[PDB]
Design an enzyme around this catalytic site. Structure first.
Site, PDB file in Angstrom:
ATOM      1  N   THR A   1       0.846  -1.232   0.000  1.00  0.00           N
ATOM      2  CA  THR A   1       0.000   0.000   0.000  1.00  0.00           C
ATOM      3  C   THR A   1       0.863   1.257   0.000  1.00  0.00           C
ATOM      4  OG1 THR A   1      -1.919  -1.004   1.100  1.00  0.00           O
ATOM      5  CG2 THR A   1      -1.678   1.377   1.323  1.00  0.00           C
ATOM      6  N   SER A   2       0.472   2.220  -0.833  1.00  0.00           N
ATOM      7  CA  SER A   2       1.067   3.550  -0.847  1.00  0.00           C
ATOM      8  C   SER A   2      -0.051   4.576  -0.713  1.00  0.00           C
ATOM      9  CB  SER A   2       1.835   3.780  -2.144  1.00  0.00           C
ATOM     10  OG  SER A   2       2.871   2.828  -2.280  1.00  0.00           O
ATOM     11  N   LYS A  33      -8.979   2.785  -1.426  1.00  0.00           N
ATOM     12  CA  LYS A  33      -8.411   2.963  -0.089  1.00  0.00           C
ATOM     13  C   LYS A  33      -8.716   4.345   0.485  1.00  0.00           C
ATOM     14  CE  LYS A  33      -4.671  -0.169  -1.370  1.00  0.00           C
ATOM     15  NZ  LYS A  33      -3.220  -0.470  -1.251  1.00  0.00           N
TER      16      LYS A  33
END
Ligand SMILES: [Mg+2]
Ligand SMILES: [Mg+2]
Ligand SMILES: [Mg+2]
Ligand SMILES: [Mg+2]
Ligand SMILES: [Mg+2]
Ligand SMILES: [Mg+2]
Lengths: 196, 212, 233, 195, 125, 222, 204, 226, 196, 195
Positions: A1-2, A33
């Protein structure tokens, strides 16, 4: 995840990739997200998807009940509710949440809540596995009071690099813009950001 | 530790050593391993020191409440079972206890109950508990008779602790003697093992292996 | 039982003739990552006390709220809240010490080491330590973490015993603290250049200094050092 | 404790139980009676973890004696065995289970039949002509399988029991200090004082 | 390859002479004179520095060698053989004594060790 | 994993005289190889002419002393300001310790004072509450260094009268308060030399019928 | 389990005026079980004395080893080994087993025959030399011995005074150790006479 | 243990405390931690005491043989290289942590060596349990172009910081000064700030206090003539 | 540790920080991690200091013996010797080495040898604990055929960020320039690079 | 194996060794002789891990018999015990150590004295008037300490030995199936066939 959230002149923008992995298998390549806990208070989620979904849903409930009684909550108030859940249940949670919101009085604000359950108010925040690779880039390139177009480019370039190096990150770059004007969703595809 | 107790014609003899160790370090040579529950009942200390101390003085409180309510001396059977039922509630928690509850009543006569932190409760004529128990058993078994005199019985208990005190590294210091009668227990003194060993060696002709 | 996540390093302190000094850097580490550079770890309570906290930052923020709540509560039905019945350093410490020991006894500690520095009503210097185990002690110099190993030796050269306290001025005491912070920056891998310093004096009161930096550093000698043994170039 | 045997013959049930009580390195006692009379025509022998054995046996005894007074009536061996099984079945999923195996020897006065029930600490009940617990069966069952007849007399049952004990004394490493033997029949419970 | 000379090159002749030892002593006889004198408070050892050429720096060629801080050696005969014996003598003073007893060997025992090395070259393959 | 226990070092010593009692302890407080404080009082006056020290893990030590002082206060409230006798205090401390039998106060407790006949008294406790009146007891880090010395110099163990050659023991003559203090100081001086956790300062509390008196002495600070 | 405390026992050595003293208990055990009350732990090779505590099989083995080595030393050197030299030999011999050591606590004591200087030394199981002026301690009651020696010892004691000091140091230390005692021996060593005294002590 | 090394104008100085410990017990109150590798190459050791002594004697022995073989005075870099390659081979199992200092024809040198075989160069170094206390002093007072007298003062002050503040260090300060073109001067017990005070009592016993069973003369002499 | 090597027009430059830590204690704050295996073949060391020192010393020996027989070795040859040691002894080594050298024929070359013992020829390489934080920055800012001054600035800015975020890195920034002109050492102090 | 005892009296050494061999849950044998004659006046009993005991004993036997032939001379008990100790001391630091404890009872014909040596698997040798291995000493030493005299006859030694065995049979949990007793004196080695 970024994931990341960046304050700018007109407010704040939240950015995120769309990759969710189970080991090396990409379980979902088009994940959202960037999640809404109030009209102009959103959050970026990292860590256990079950945990962060459960927390967000509880916060949304709390801010909905808050609004019914006391009117629109501040971004600080939303961050406090997130913190209370994360801190008090730290032994059973794996959640790294960035809270971002727009008031008219306070304008754009960003709060980061790492694993421990502490709160940190920042001009911008980065988190998730892919964030490690862009601490240098983001620190060198961030300026306060950027324009909307500059902030979108900053987030786009940053997450592009995070995606490039982090196997756990990828897919599309989703963004949500929070200003007085309203709420604007943006999406950027691989063919666009990979060539940057 | 070495503790023993045995029934005989004249009642019960209780004999214990006095040593307490923490590993190889001798913490004390003057420990009291006979708990005076009340003037009629005695208990021995082995395993956990505090567990034996605490719960056997507690037992004395329960015995006192019994005879206040029932206007009658508690039986050794009833007293021992109060203690065994108590430790059985704690089973698994980590109590450490190996004790002889000793008494002399009208209805029972001289009675000894071995009580255990695993919940064991055994009536018997001769009991030996502790790290030096095997040494004491040898002297007891080969010399024990029901028709021993109070004088000879007291010596046998003393000599059996001495046997253990000599061989067992974790037993020694001094010997405490008690004689339990129907009218109550009678204390028969503290006997230093150092002085007792040489005295017994000379008078008895035993321990020829040791140079004195 | 937990593990600390976001952490703060050394808090150092010492007594001088008219009061106490306490200092701590502005870093919130995330393991080896120097994550947060603007963390204030000295938290003043009233105008007579400063609580310095190291260890877990989330627990520090919790403690920070307890102290804020303590001031509010003390003011309730208290006409002398800003006078005779104001919070003393000794009251604040004993409260924290109680909480720390209770929490360790429930096997759920506040993962911190705390130094309460202040000046009492009668002008007496207060300086006492408490940590996640509820262990407490007092000394002319006190320091947590790396400070214990590197700062105390230096600060003890100024105030080696109780009788050295009246002989130590605020200028000498502050100088020693500032030098100690430089040494910690050289040698502690989880430290930062930016720090805060607080002085609590019985005459001049509470002086809180923010945005201080380690300066007068020696690095020039590094140019001459080459290789790890035999290398000349 | 160690060895407990049971054999149901024509008109009685015979229970044999070892006398030794060992606590670690020493044999503390060589005359221990590992049995309790639950009712005038029902006897229960037991073996398992220290403390639990006697605590469980006496608890069952008290409950059956309570029933006997309340109803002025003796429960059948089958009824007693079912009650005991349930208690052990309840126990196995408790915080700290009773580690106790039992044999219940009883004479049913209604049916005029001897009955032997074998129940382990899990609550595993079986009605048998002969039974045992632990390693006892490993040494004795081959002899019992060979010699046993359902129409045996009490005296023949005792002789077959002696042969079982002799085999145990020969091949078992542990010294169990002999056995106390008790007979349960229409007249009640009695101990064979010479064995 | 391999050293296939695993047999003695020094052997007893019919007369009982060990030829190679006698011939070695003949080589010593041809060598330059060296001497030793013992006093009550010291010992002296001396020899001639027979320079093979005047262009050669005879200071670099040490005929007299320190074995230990309290022991020295001088020779007559073949110089190269001496040089390696000095190396072995210095090392054996450490390996078979100083590293065991924490002190330097006495003269007689170091001599004994040197003698052993020379004996072995008289019997080994 | 979180470890709720720690070792703060320190060494304490209680000696019962004929009409007095002393409880001494070093003032050094440590963790691992670091010194926390060179002067951190360890022996406390608990009122009613009783002195106490709970050596080992200082947090549990402070907690126990605090609860016992509290117990003395409530004993006065509940029983018409009656003086808590040293034997009664000892039994009370047993119950305080045994209360945490399964999560013990990690300390070795010693109290000292006078019994109801005015004679010197010392009581010694293990971490879980087993206790016992004693004439002489060292506790803590250097206890193994001090006790053998006390067996020899207080109780005259292994000492016989010259000329008799092992036949007559040296008689157990009573020691004065000045004589005891000498043995306490030499015990701690020796312990300081050979034990790294012992040093800095020695604080002695002397109990008599007149009350509690304090004496302080320097120890080596290395 | 711990090899250095299975058998138990202690050795202590002290220096005096023109003399040294070395002493040991006589106990050999199997943990709690007392096995022998005649197991002497002090040996001598010429005028050099060696005490050895720890695992009893290694005590025996090392004694046999140093007898072996000092006998060859004497044949080659044509003189008896000295305490300073023997100390280095003990150190060398222990360290050659660095990664498979003898579980012992040796103590050397003696007077140099040429200089007349009193000498003592101690080692860990692996060979590190402790050359103290005052005293050396070893064994399962080493803490107790350190306490006794530190308080009882004073320098330049005469032989018959030193005997009392070392004896009282050993006895009272052993009485606070479960695995030490069962008798004791004291050697008083002068330049050309050595007196050996067995002490009377409690046998528990 | 506290050991330090400090470079100065015309050489280098090393120093050390004199306490050796067995757990919390002080085995020797005046231990000699400054060891000689060669006349003008000295080192101070921390960690496993047998290993530090053993490894310095071995390298010291091989250094002497090397010096004799090459007809040259030994160099510190040779001691360093031989020490590190030995320690590396044994992968840290030889628990030797050394500060090596000395002078040779190349000049004055100061190195540290860790048990796994890594080495470091510096103008000031500290090792042992009191290294942090010592390094605090060194970082506070060290400067370039120290004199001989200043370096001795700094080195011993750094050891003192360890003595007082580190429980693993104590007693006295040993110093050795290695200056270029001079004999190295070993200053055993350079400072003595920890003398024990006189005891309150004498514990000399009356003669005959100890009970004796048997006396006998031990035959230390050889088998006699006639 | 933060280390890197960057090829440019005139050759190659190696860069490194100077911090060596034992846990959180800085054992050496002025370490030289730029080590010479030949006149114009150097390396940057990361991982176990004992291992990387031992390897480098062996390589220097091999290249010295190579030179005596066959003349000056190539940078590829030096990298091969490093690889051979790292690969064959992978079970007992923790070494991450960047090899950089200057030939006249091949000019500036950079080879990286990570933990496994593989070899990768690159235009530039980054390694050490601090490298994680500058993957984004270095990828965005690196250009081929930079000047000497540009490459020094690129390395200085990169390691400045690595030092800023990595606690294991710090002290001075050392650099070694390898060109036809010769070998030039550079050093940059905290007061210089922190304000960048 | 289990119990091995030894007692040195006036003019002889007596070794008592259990007969049981228990391998598993069964007692496979009740007549096993846990001893080997090393020389005409030297006997060695042994107890420890299976296989190792007999392998070690026979290896020692062969070596002493070899020495006896080579020199035409019987080694003293002291010499034999030292040889045995060294082998065990060598064994303890081997790849797989001999797990064997031994008693060596011998009559020294030169000194005209009986000698008993106790050696454990570590190579821990002690000369004793009486000795044992394992738990045997725990039960028997208090009796031996009390009754033993150095001037005892062989018949008195056997009576004291019977008392030791009786105490073992009473208090030991394991059934060791009695003991084989052998006497070593000036005339050699002989077995007491009734015990
Ligand atoms: Mg000290
Ligand atoms: Mg003892
Ligand atoms: Mg004993
Ligand atoms: Mg390695
Ligand atoms: Mg940094
Ligand atoms: Mg043995």
């Amino acid at each position: 995840t970024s994931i990341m959230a960046v304050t700018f002149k007109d407010g704040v923008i939240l950015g995120a990739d769309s990759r969710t992995t189970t080991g090396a298998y990409i379980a979902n390549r088009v994940t959202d997200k960037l999640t809404r806990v109030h009209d102009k208070i959103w959050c970026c989620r990292s860590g256990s998807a079950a945990d962060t979904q459960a927390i967000a849903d509880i916060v949304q409930y709390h801010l909905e009940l808050y609004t019914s009684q006391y009117g629109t909550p501040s971004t600080e108030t939303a961050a406090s509710v997130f913190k209370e859940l994360c801190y008090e249940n730290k032994d059973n949670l794996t959640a790294g949440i960035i809270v971002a919101g727009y008031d008219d009085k306070n304008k754009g604000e960003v709060y980061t809540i790492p694993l421990g359950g502490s709160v940190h108010k920042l001009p911008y925040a980065i988190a998730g596995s892919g964030s490690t690779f862009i601490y240098g880039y983001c620190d060198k390139n961030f300026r306060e009071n950027m324009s909307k177009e500059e902030t979108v480019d900053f987030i786009k370039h940053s997450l592009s690099q995070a995606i490039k190096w982090d196997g756990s990150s990828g897919g599309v770059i989703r963004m949500v813009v929070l200003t007085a004007a309203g709420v604007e969703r943006l999406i950027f595809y691989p063919d666009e950001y990979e060539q940057l | 530790t070495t503790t023993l107790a045995f029934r005989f014609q004249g009642g019960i003899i209780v004999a214990v050593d006095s040593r307490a160790t923490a590993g190889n370090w001798v913490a004390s040579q003057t420990v009291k391993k006979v708990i005076e529950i009340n003037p009629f009942l005695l208990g021995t200390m082995a395993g956990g020191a505090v567990d034996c101390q605490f719960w056997e003085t507690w037992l004395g409180s329960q015995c006192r409440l019994h005879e206040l309510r029932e206007k009658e001396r508690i039986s050794v059977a009833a007293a021992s079972k109060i203690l065994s039922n108590l430790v059985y509630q704690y089973k698994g928690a980590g109590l450490s206890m190996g004790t002889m509850i000793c008494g002399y009543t009208r209805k029972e006569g001289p009675t000894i109950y071995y009580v255990d932190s695993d919940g064991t409760r055994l009536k018997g004529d001769i009991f030996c508990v502790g790290s030096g128990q095997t040494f004491a058993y040898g002297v007891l078994d080969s010399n024990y008779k029901w028709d021993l005199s109070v004088e000879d019985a007291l010596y046998l208990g003393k000599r059996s602790i001495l046997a253990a005190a000599h061989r067992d590294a974790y037993s020694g210091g001094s010997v405490n003697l008690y004689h339990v009668t129907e009218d109550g227990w009678i204390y028969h003194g503290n006997h230093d093992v150092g002085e007792l060993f040489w005295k017994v060696k000379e008078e008895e002709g035993s321990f020829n292996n040791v140079i004195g | 039982t937990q593990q600390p996540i976001v952490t703060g390093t050394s808090v150092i302190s010492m007594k001088y003739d008219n009061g106490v000094i306490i200092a701590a850097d502005n870093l919130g580490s995330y393991g080896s990552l120097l994550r947060f550079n603007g963390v204030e770890r000295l938290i003043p309570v009233g105008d007579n006390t400063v609580v310095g906290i190291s260890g877990d930052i989330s627990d520090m923020q919790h403690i920070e709220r307890l102290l804020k709540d303590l001031v509010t509560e003390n003011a309730y039905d208290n006409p002398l809240a800003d006078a005779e019945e104001a919070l003393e350093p000794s009251y604040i410490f004993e409260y924290l010490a109680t909480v720390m020991y209770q929490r360790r006894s429930k096997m759920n500690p506040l993962w911190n080491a705390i130094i309460v520095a202040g000046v009492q009503s009668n002008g007496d210097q207060f300086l006492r330590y408490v940590n996640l185990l509820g262990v407490t002690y007092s000394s002319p110099t006190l320091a947590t973490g790396f400070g214990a190993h590197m700062a105390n030796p230096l600060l003890r050269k100024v105030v080696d015993r109780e009788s050295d306290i009246p002989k130590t001025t605020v200028q000498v005491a502050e100088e020693a603290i500032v030098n100690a912070m430089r040494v910690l920056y050289y040698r502690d891998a989880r430290s930062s250049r930016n720090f805060s310093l607080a002085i609590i004096d019985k005459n001049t009161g509470l002086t809180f200094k923010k945005n201080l930096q380690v300066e007068n550093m020696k690095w020039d000698f590094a140019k001459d050092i080459k290789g790890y043994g035999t290398q000349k170039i | 404790m160690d060895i407990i045997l049971g054999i149901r013959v024509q008109d009685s049930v015979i229970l044999a139980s070892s006398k030794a009580v060992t606590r670690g390195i020493s044999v503390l006692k060589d005359s221990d009676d590992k049995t309790r009379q639950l009712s005038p025509h029902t006897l229960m022998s037991f073996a398992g973890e220290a403390g639990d054995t006697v605590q469980f046996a006496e608890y069952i005894q008290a409950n059956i004696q309570l029933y006997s007074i309340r109803e002025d009536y003796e429960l059948s061996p089958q009824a007693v065995s079912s009650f005991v099984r349930q208690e052990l079945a309840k126990s196995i999923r408790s915080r700290r289970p009773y580690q106790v195996n039992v044999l219940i020897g009883g004479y049913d006065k209604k049916k005029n039949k001897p009955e032997l029930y074998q129940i382990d600490y899990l609550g595993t009940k079986v009605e048998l002509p002969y039974g045992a617990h632990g390693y006892s069966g490993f040494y004795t069952f081959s002899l019992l399988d060979h010699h046993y007849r359902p129409d045996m007399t009490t005296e023949e049952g005792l002789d077959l029991l002696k042969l079982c004990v002799q085999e145990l004394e020969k091949r078992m490493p542990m010294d169990f200090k002999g056995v106390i033997v008790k007979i349960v029949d229409k007249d009640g419970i009695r101990q064979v004082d010479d064995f | 390859m391999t050293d296939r000379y695993s047999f003695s090159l020094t052997t007893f002749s019919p007369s009982g002479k060990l030829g190679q030892i006698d011939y070695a002593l003949t080589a010593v006889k041809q060598g330059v004179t060296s001497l030793g004198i013992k006093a009550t408070n010291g010992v002296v050892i001396a020899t001639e520095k027979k320079s093979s050429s005047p262009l050669a720096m005879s200071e670099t060629l040490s005929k007299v060698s320190l074995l230990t801080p309290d022991i020295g050696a001088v020779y007559s005969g073949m110089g190269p053989d001496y040089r390696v014996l000095v190396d072995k003598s210095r090392k054996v003073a450490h390996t078979s004594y100083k590293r065991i007893y924490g002190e330097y060997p006495p003269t007689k025992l170091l001599v004994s060790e040197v003698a052993k090395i020379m004996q072995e070259a008289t019997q080994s393959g | 994993q979180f470890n709720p226990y720690g070792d703060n070092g320190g060494t304490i010593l209680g000696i019962a005289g004929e009409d007095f009692a002393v409880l001494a302890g070093d003032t050094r407080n440590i963790t691992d190889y670091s010194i926390n404080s060179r002067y951190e009082p360890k022996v406390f006056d608990c009122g009613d002419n009783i002195v106490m020290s709970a050596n080992g893990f200082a947090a549990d030590g402070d907690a126990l002393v605090k609860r016992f002082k509290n117990s003395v206060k409530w004993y006065h409230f509940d029983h018409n300001d009656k003086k808590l006798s040293i034997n009664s205090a000892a039994r009370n401390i047993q119950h305080l310790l045994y209360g945490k039998r399964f999560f013990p106060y990690y300390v070795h407790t010693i109290i000292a004072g006078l019994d109801e006949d005015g004679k010197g008294a010392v009581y010694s406790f293990d971490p879980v509450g087993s206790y016992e009146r004693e004439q002489c007891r060292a506790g803590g880090a250097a206890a193994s260094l001090i006790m053998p010395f006390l067996d020899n110099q207080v109780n005259f163990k292994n000492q016989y009268e010259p000329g008799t050659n092992g036949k007559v023991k040296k008689p157990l003559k009573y020691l004065s308060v000045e004589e005891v203090i000498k043995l306490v100081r030499d015990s701690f001086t020796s312990a300081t030399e050979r034990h790294i956790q012992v040093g800095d300062g020695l604080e002695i509390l002397i109990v008599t019928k007149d009350g509690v008196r304090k004496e302080f002495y320097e120890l080596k600070r290395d | 389990s711990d090899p250095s405390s299975i058998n138990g026992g202690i050795v202590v050595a002290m220096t005096g005026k023109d003399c040294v003293a070395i002493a040991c208990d006589l106990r050999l055990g199997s943990q709690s079980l007392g096995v022998s009350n005649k197991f002497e732990k002090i040996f001598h090779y010429g005028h050099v004395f060696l005490g050895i505590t720890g695992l009893a099989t290694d005590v025996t083995t090392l004694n046999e080893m140093f007898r072996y080595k000092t006998n060859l030393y004497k044949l080659k050197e044509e003189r008896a080994i000295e305490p300073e030299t023997f100390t280095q030999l003990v150190s060398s011999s222990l360290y050659e087993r660095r990664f498979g050591p003898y579980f012992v606590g040796p103590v050397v004591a003696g007077i140099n025959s040429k200089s007349g200087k009193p000498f003592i030394a101690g080692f860990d199981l692996i060979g590190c030399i402790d050359e103290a002026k005052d005293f050396i301690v070893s064994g399962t009651a080493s803490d107790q011995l350190f306490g006794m020696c530190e308080s009882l010892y004073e320098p330049n004691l005469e032989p018959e005074d030193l005997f009392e000091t070392i004896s009282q140091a050993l006895l009272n230390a052993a009485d606070r150790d479960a695995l030490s005692g069962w008798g004791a021996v004291v050697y008083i060593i002068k330049k050309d006479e050595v007196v050996k005294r067995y002490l009377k002590m409690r046998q528990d | 243990t506290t050991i330090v090394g400090v470079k100065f104008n015309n050489g280098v100085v090393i120093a050390a405390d004199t306490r050796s410990t067995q757990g919390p017990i002080v085995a020797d109150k005046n231990c000699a931690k400054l060891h000689r590798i060669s006349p003008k190459i000295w080192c101070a050791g921390a960690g496993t005491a047998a290993d530090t002594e053993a490894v310095t004697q071995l390298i010291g022995s091989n250094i002497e043989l090397h010096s004799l073989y090459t007809s040259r005075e030994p160099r510190v870099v040779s001691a360093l290289q031989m020490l590190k390659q030995h320690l590396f081979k044994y992968q840290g199992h030889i628990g030797a942590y050394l500060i090596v200092a000395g002078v040779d024809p190349t000049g004055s040198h100061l190195f540290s060596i860790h048990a796994h075989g890594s080495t470091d160069v510096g103008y000031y170094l500290s090792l042992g349990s009191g290294s942090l206390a010592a390094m605090a002093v060194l970082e506070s007072h060290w400067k370039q172009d120290l004199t001989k007298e200043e370096a001795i003062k700094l080195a011993s002050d750094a050891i003192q910081a360890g003595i007082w503040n580190d429980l693993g260090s104590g007693s006295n300060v040993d110093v050795c000064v290695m200056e270029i073109g001079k004999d190295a001067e070993y200053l055993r017990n350079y400072l003595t700030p920890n003398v024990r005070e006189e005891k309150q009592k004498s514990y000399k016993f009356p003669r005959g206090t100890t009970a004796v069973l048997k006396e006998s003369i031990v035959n230390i002499c050889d088998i006699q003539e006639e």
